[PDB]
Amino acid sequence: DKPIYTLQYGNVGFVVNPKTVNQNARLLMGYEYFTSRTELVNAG
Amino acid sequence: MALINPQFPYAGPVPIPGPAPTETMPLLNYRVEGRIAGIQQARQFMPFLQGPHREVAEQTYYAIGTGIQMGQTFNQPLINTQEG
Lengths: 44, 84
Fold this sequence. Notes:
The structure is cut from a larger assembly and holds chains A (about 45 residues) and B (about 80 residues).
Chain A lengths: L44
Chain B lengths: L84
PDB class: virus
Keywords: Phage, Tectiviridae, Membrane, double-barrel, helix turn helix, helix with a kink, beta-propeller, heteropentamer, penton, virus
Entry title: High resolution electron cryo-microscopy structure of the bacteriophage PR772
């Protein structure tokens, strides 16, 4: 409904506070997003 | 747009029992005066900044100077006595 749109680099973060951390513990992120590309001509 | 049956016609509606006529009439609901309560604060400590941002970063510069320029001991050429 309200997409996260940072506008300078470093504007919104995602936080996880763990309680127990083992060896080789990681955090696997997965995003979906909208973006605009280059060659903005729009079917010339 | 029905067609009248001439062999078996019918008449208009006859009176039937009714639904107690005042109980189909509503009251007009009587609004009292109201108030958006409290004294509102003038400003809010917003979680996002209200100004523009920049998409790309541009390299900035500032001018510097060099230093006091000295002389030099050049290696000097030979004399052009028709060999050169």
